[PDB]
Symmetry: C2
Subunit: 167 residues, 2 copies
């Protein structure tokens, strides 16, 4: 078109720099959310290991890490979840991301995160029965559903940026 | 060039992002498999004291199988992806070596369970196997962070 090389270059550089900023935004949200999700799963598994060790200790068998060591490890991983979740929330968002879906991920994150913190409290208090009975699976499932939707949203944004860069 | 520089910086983020999504997906599915197997352990022990609720040991065992296949699926996604030239090939081999150990360990637990080999099931030092993978996963992530931070700059 009746547009010069200088112009074509400026426009290409403008778009590239915009596209890059989108990928950066998305990559960071992805790594922080992922780090929070993994640390919650770790916490959950560690608490289950603690329950097993407890039930093993009843019949004076049971080895490996102690209930106390496992509880402390779960606390450390829950702190890792929280750290990653704070980083996630503070990141600048892309204007096109749904604020409604962001609110849902957060709602489910708090339910699941709080359930694990509660398990840690129940355990350290001796409320073993309460501990074994929490419907944790449902809480986790609710966060995961949102996590998937969020990633699907971000993959789309990713693709828009890629398509543009290719053209 | 300002342009070719940016067109390549964007390529780095793209390749890194996609490797991350799939590798993290595989890691999440492995973690879920391990947790589900520990749920089956609890359930079995509850069955021994004649209480014992929700999902059965058999149902959890099947669930763990499905989630382990999901790890394999995400792993194959990751394994087919293109690697950036600057990424460590030695690290890429060590993550694979550690995924295999951890994956195989989970495959074994499922086998042990569906054969009633309960002692061996509870015996397995799964934690060490997971830790081996995790350590490589962290280094890989740290490497990707560095490649991310250089792209934001060159931009």
């Amino acid at each position: 078109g009746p547009l010069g090389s200088g112009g074509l270059f400026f426009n290409a550089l403008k778009n590239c720099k915009e596209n890059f900023t989108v990928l950066q935004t998305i990559r960071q949200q992805q790594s922080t959310l992922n780090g929070s999700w993994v640390a919650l799963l770790q916490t959950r598994n560690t608490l289950n290991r603690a329950g097993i060790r407890y039930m093993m200790d009843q019949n004076n068998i049971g080895s490996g890490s102690t209930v106390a060591e496992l509880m402390e490890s779960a606390s450390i991983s829950l702190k890792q979840a929280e750290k990653n979740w704070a980083d996630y929330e503070a990141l600048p968002r892309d204007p096109r991301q749904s604020t409604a879906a962001a609110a849902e991920i957060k709602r489910n994150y708090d339910i699941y995160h709080n359930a694990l913190a509660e398990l840690i409290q129940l355990l350290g208090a001796g409320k073993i029965n309460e501990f074994f009975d929490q419907p944790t699976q449902g809480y986790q499932d609710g966060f995961e559903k949102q996590y998937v939707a969020y990633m699907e949203q971000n993959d789309r944004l990713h693709d828009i940026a890629v398509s543009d860069n290719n053209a």
